[PDB]
Design goal:
By secondary structure, the chain is an alpha+beta fold. It has a single domain, classed as Ubiquitin Conjugating Enzyme (Roll). The longest helix is centred in the N-terminal third of the chain and has 15 residues. GO terms for molecular function: ATP binding; ubiquitin conjugating enzyme activity; ubiquitin protein ligase activity; ubiquitin-protein transferase activity. Belongs to the ubiquitin-conjugating enzyme family. Pathway: Protein modification; protein ubiquitination.
Length: about 150
């Protein structure tokens, strides 16, 4: 009923907002007919090491959305302290900081911010976190190499 359909209706509302006011340089939407499974794309931010890259992500919404966060994973390889080989993302709003006021659009914005400003203190990839902290220029160079190698 209306309660049971809450998640579905909310996902539809978010999709309509996204499509109506397209988020800069990003896209996201259902893969097929299952509204709980989406794909997204993020363009590497300009003047970041990732510029010119296109990164693909998978989004799965929980049955109780919006009261629990979506599960989000990169399917494009990326060199970043907070994103692992499996494309898992260490991002506060995906875990302990989720709120039903958050939306897919906000998540995409947060991920874009994360790309621009990594959090080396809470890394998923220790060596990338170390290089980011110790030699930012070297980090940028390698992130650029990976962008050319796997995101273009």
């Amino acid at each position: 009923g209306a309660m049971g359909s809450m998640a579905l209706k909310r996902i539809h509302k978010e999709l309509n907002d996204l499509a109506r006011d397209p988020p800069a340089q990003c896209s996201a939407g259902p893969v097929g007919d299952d509204m709980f499974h989406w794909q997204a794309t993020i363009m590497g931010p300009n003047d970041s090491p990732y510029q010119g890259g296109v990164f693909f992500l998978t989004i799965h919404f929980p049955t109780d959305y919006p009261f629990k966060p979506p599960k989000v994973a990169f399917t494009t390889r990326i060199y970043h302290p907070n994103i692992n080989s499996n494309g898992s993302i260490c991002l506060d709003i995906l875990r302990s900081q989720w709120s039903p006021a958050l939306t897919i659009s906000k998540v995409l914005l947060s991920i874009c911010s994360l790309l621009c400003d990594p959090n080396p203190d809470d890394p998923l990839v220790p060596e990338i976190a170390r290089i980011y902290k110790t030699d930012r220029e070297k980090y940028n160079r390698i992130a650029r190499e990976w962008t050319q190698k796997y995101a273009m």
